[PDB]
Scaffold this active site. Sequence first.
Site, mmCIF file in Angstrom:
data_model
loop_
_atom_site.group_PDB
_atom_site.id
_atom_site.type_symbol
_atom_site.label_atom_id
_atom_site.label_comp_id
_atom_site.label_asym_id
_atom_site.label_seq_id
_atom_site.Cartn_x
_atom_site.Cartn_y
_atom_site.Cartn_z
ATOM 1 N N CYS A 88 5.149 28.113 30.661
ATOM 2 C CA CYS A 88 4.800 29.280 29.842
ATOM 3 C C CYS A 88 5.775 30.426 30.190
ATOM 4 O O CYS A 88 5.393 31.427 30.830
ATOM 5 C CB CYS A 88 3.344 29.681 30.057
ATOM 6 S SG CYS A 88 2.687 30.861 28.828
ATOM 7 N N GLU B 6 4.855 34.313 50.242
ATOM 8 C CA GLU B 6 4.470 35.192 49.120
ATOM 9 C C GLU B 6 5.310 36.464 49.051
ATOM 10 O O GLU B 6 5.763 36.859 47.955
ATOM 11 C CB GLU B 6 2.973 35.543 49.211
ATOM 12 C CG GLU B 6 2.076 34.336 48.876
ATOM 13 C CD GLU B 6 2.093 33.923 47.424
ATOM 14 O OE1 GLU B 6 1.822 34.843 46.584
ATOM 15 O OE2 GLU B 6 2.402 32.738 47.134
ATOM 16 N N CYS C 92 2.364 21.766 27.998
ATOM 17 C CA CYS C 92 1.346 22.617 28.621
ATOM 18 C C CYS C 92 -0.059 22.016 28.506
ATOM 19 O O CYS C 92 -0.469 21.623 27.381
ATOM 20 C CB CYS C 92 1.374 24.029 27.986
ATOM 21 S SG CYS C 92 0.140 25.168 28.768
ATOM 22 N N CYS D 25 5.257 24.695 24.945
ATOM 23 C CA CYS D 25 3.835 24.456 24.701
ATOM 24 C C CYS D 25 3.508 22.960 24.699
ATOM 25 O O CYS D 25 2.400 22.530 25.087
ATOM 26 C CB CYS D 25 3.404 25.116 23.371
ATOM 27 S SG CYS D 25 3.579 26.949 23.383
HETATM 28 S S1 SF4 Z 1 0.151 26.485 25.090
HETATM 29 FE FE1 SF4 Z 1 0.591 26.943 27.304
HETATM 30 S S2 SF4 Z 1 2.925 27.353 27.307
HETATM 31 FE FE2 SF4 Z 1 2.193 27.630 25.140
HETATM 32 S S3 SF4 Z 1 1.719 29.936 24.984
HETATM 33 FE FE3 SF4 Z 1 -0.275 28.774 25.473
HETATM 34 S S4 SF4 Z 1 -0.526 28.955 27.742
HETATM 35 FE FE4 SF4 Z 1 1.728 29.405 27.234
#
Ligand code: SF4
Length: 225
Positions: free
Chosen positions: A192, A37, A202, A199
């Site tokens: 992200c 870390e 994600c 996205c």
């Molecule tokens: S869908 Fe996921 S990658 Fe896209 S802005 Fe939202 S949290 Fe971030």
Amino acid sequence: MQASQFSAQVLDWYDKYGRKTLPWQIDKTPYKVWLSEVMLQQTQVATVIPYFERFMARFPTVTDLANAPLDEVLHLWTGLGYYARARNLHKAAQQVATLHGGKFPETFEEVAALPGVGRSTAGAILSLSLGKHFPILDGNVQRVLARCYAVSGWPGKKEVENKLWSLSEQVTPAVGVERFNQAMMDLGAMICTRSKPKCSLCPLQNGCIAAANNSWALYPGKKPK
Ligand code: SF4
């Protein structure tokens, strides 16, 4: 989205796509997680791995690190930059040897009292190495939460920081805390991202407010001019 749906979708993503084979993830201990870390706070993973391996070979235990001369620690650190981290690393190893018998402490207050270790790093050490029920909040994790839940405001304002910590506590589960906290770091590091987030890759895309409005650039807020 409901906090129980947030946690379940991140855990299902981690099972299939998460990072599980970094050296500090195998045969984990408090010492290995703390050392990794600190190295990762201001340095990318590819650069850190050879340094992590050299430090574990030279200093197998926190007492070996504590008894070494500071100049030898700084020589092995050369190339990682931000050497206040190395000065504090050595002092913290000496505090564990002196106050705690050479065994890493297992309570939040005693870990956070170590030089170089703040609230998020303390929760990371105890959750990832022993399964204790604490959330984390570094820059990667804060970007995911601020986009999914639409938290504007500069996190350098205390009321915004406090809102982000409460959101992190709300979505972090007890069952699978080690998997969840690593998965949030993986999402912020690789999906992200600060610019142009991926996205479509994600697991939060079906409930994220920034994705629904194409408004990722607003979250988190920047420092006012
Ligand atoms: S869908 Fe996921 S990658 Fe896209 S802005 Fe939202 S949290 Fe971030």
